[PDB]
Amino acid sequence: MIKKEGPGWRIIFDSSRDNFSTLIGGETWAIELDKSEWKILVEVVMELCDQYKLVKEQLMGDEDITLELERRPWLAILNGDQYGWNLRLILSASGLFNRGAEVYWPRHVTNNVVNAMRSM
Amino acid sequence: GMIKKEGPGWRIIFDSSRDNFSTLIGGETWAIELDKSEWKILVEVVMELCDQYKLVKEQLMGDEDITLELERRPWLAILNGDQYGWNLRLILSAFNRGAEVYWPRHVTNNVVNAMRSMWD
Numbered sequence: 697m698i699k700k701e702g703p704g705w706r707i708i709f710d711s712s713r714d715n716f717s718t719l720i721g722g723e724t725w726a727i728e729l730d731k732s733e734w735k736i737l738v739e740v741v742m743e744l745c746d747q748y749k750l751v752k753e754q755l756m757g758d759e760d761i762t763l764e765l766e767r768r769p770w771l772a773i774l775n776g777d778q779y780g781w782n783l784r785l786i787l788s789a790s791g792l793f794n795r796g797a798e799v800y801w802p803r804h805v806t807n808n809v810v811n812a813m814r815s816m
Numbered sequence: 817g818m819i820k821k822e823g824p825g826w827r828i829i830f831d832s833s834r835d836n837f838s839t840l841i842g843g844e845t846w847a848i849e850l851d852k853s854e855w856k857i858l859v860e861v862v863m864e865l866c867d868q869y870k871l872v873k874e875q876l877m878g879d880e881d882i883t884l885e886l887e888r889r890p891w892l893a894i895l896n897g898d899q900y901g902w903n904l905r906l907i908l909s910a911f912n913r914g915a916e917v918y919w920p921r922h923v924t925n926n927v928v929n930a931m932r933s934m935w936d
């Protein structure tokens with residue numbers, strides 16, 4: 697199909713699926729997403745990561761930062777320091793099939809995930 | 817209202833105000849919401865695997881392991897263990913959103929105990 701992956705993460709797109717055509721995964725979880733959800737997720741994550749990369753330049757030592765960005769149906773929560781960041785994602789439920797979910801990628805793995813998203 | 821049970825590495829939550837996705841199951845890095853039909857089957861599948869493992873477990877010597885897989889749509893569950901414990905991989909098929917989740921050794925026993933006692 698169309699697959700990008702590495703230690704602790706994966707992104708898979710399957711065009712034969714008329715609805716849940718994208719899969720995102722971490723080390724112990726994976727969830728399917730519809731085209732709308734996927735589009736908004738990439739937008740949110742790219743913005744939050746861009747915000748983090750710019751602001752991390754003023755962090756002294758092991759000073760931490762927490763950033764959140766919400767764009768329905770997603771709430772993205774970033775926690776990091778000048779050396780890395782983790783990301784918790786809360787997907788609010790919608791309609792009959794779009795169950796809610798909460799997922800998380802740890803420090804360092806996040807950079808690999810956003811690079812994959814960015815290329816897609 | 818809400819009934820929640822939680823411990824290191826897991827949680828289960830029932831929210832009586834939700835019309836559809838009224839149950840949440842969680843691991844350390846993930847959570848997914850479930851509808852009542854999915855919850856009922858999940859518990860029956862896990863209880864069936866857990867009981868079978870408990871029997872097999874008394875013939876397991878040293879490092880001897882067992883793998884038990886059970887599919888009862890929409891769930892496919894895979895139990896891997898030895899005489900000291902077991903982990904559990906769950907695949908939830910999509911046409912509700914698909915997902916895959918995992919609980920490690922020792923955590924599984926607590927999850928099972930919570931499943932068995934949700935209403936006491």
Ligand SMILES: [Cl-]
Binds near residue numbers: 834
């Ligand atoms: Cl609902």
